Amino acid sequence: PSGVEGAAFQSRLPHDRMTSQEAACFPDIISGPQQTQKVFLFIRNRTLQLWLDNPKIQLTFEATLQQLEAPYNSDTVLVHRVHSYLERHGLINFGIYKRIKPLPTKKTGKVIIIGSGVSGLAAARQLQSFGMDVTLLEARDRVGGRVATFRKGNYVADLGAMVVTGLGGNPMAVVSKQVNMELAKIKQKCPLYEANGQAVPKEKDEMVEQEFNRLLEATSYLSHQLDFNVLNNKPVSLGQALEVVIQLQEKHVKDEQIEHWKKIVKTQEELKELLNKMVNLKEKIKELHQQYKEASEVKPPRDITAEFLVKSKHRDLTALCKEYDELAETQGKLEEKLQELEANPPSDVYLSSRDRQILDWHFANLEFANATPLSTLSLKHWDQDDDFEFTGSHLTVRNGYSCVPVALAEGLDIKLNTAVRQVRYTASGCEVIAVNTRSTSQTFIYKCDAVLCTLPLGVLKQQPPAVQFVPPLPEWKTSAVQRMGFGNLNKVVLCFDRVFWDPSVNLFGHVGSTTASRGELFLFWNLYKAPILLALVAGEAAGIMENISDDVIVGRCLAILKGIFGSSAVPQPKETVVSRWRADPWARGSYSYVAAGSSGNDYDLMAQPITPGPSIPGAPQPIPRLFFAGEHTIRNYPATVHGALLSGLREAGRIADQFLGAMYTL
């Protein structure tokens, strides 16, 4: 879309309808008359358009009203309510922009942000823009968290986030205009290469892939239409479901054969009954011919009875010869009907070992996309976020993704090498106890009005806990933490001195030997300016390959590449890097997935802030003190950068509303 309505789409909002969040802030309008609403919606959309058309400068209420028309610019308290609402929830003026009105003289309220991942940084920038005292505590020696970017010489490769998943509605599309991001499209095509090192034929390729998608759609049918979602009390995984589908597909292949051969024996048994009849007729024709012959040996003259006997036997024979000719007719029809059925048999097998191997690569792809064994994904919900995916080509940050968190970090109080150990929240406020990662006995205490926690789900999962909450987090929250899935996927960076692969092909697969190793080095990326190949380790294999040294991994890398490109066409890699996210103490995995027994609803539970008990018993209900942002908190955009980004924006708004008050609700 384009124009005013396109801005609403780009901002993930329906252009012609008021959202649930809008209904909360403008309950007068939404319950009011249809005319008012359309005015409101326009004002909203028009303001968004303005900010979007130029996101490198702050959009003020002045500048907004300036560029509005009649009758829309007549009511200025409406325009102000709109502008503020949008600015509060980071729909306008977010990221890196030049401020027209320099920051307020002095700050209001104090917020400690745990972790300087993208969600953290996003929220921090916002809160500071709202004029609050903000300090981030990063355990690492760098910003970005799960946005890691390897750099050496001219080699640049992302060990974490890498792909901008389409600009159509992406808040990152805004960010990319604010930051020097070199965005390059990824060409869809991905040729496969079997264990031998030779390409899968386009005949096979196209119609294994087809079967894959067909098998997926099948599981969806099991899930929704058949409601196959519980089995022995345990929730059904996607893996379980796929297995069941494949089995039912193998069963059908056999059922076809059985009823086909069963049709042959029913015709083969008709032929048997006919041949028996034909033999018994040739028996009696043999006998009757003899009798007629003997009757014709009686030379004339003969009396009438003896004359009749010759005539009789003649008739009786041509009668039986008539029948046999009609039976030889029937034999001719059934004899070709047997050659009919035996000519075109049904499918021999559902999939061969060679087929099933290529299909396992497609499962590995799915296991990569979810960063987890398909036996862990929720059947019903694994894809619950589908309706919200952005439009457009997927792109790669060619100059490295780190450029984004780094750029966001500018002008922020970030305490690097500071590992939070304990969060203490009470009715009167919060203290955060952290240590120095280097000399771990050196302690820090932080006092604040509110704590925003952007700790990765894998961290919140640790047992025994890496961070202690005082008081303990409520049962509903910890249940959500356990229920949810935190996955794992690793990357192998190979830096060569020369390009030896197809320069116009961005990615190519490798089909592994067994199901067990289907994710092991199953995919390779050529994206960057420099000659760098990037190899993915996914699924079950991801977890195990962490116990294996770099040399051994880089070995297996070259082994596969040699088999594909030539034993002497693959040189020794100048620089090599291997990720270990599950081992990394500040991640404990890669990103989240909807685990079996979980749902999208859990992601909402994660976002719900914690309100402490009262100090003095019988004193009023306190303020919410402990807030959560992060990739694992955003139901509609989990496991992404923009997801984290938006969660950050979200919490900042909620915190600001809480501590600076919402003026825009009159």
């Binding site: 792909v163 991905c190 996309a369 979810n370 894809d383 976020d385 496991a639």
Partner: peptide
Amino acid sequence: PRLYLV
């Protein structure tokens, strides 16, 4: 999620 599928 499904978004990353190659």
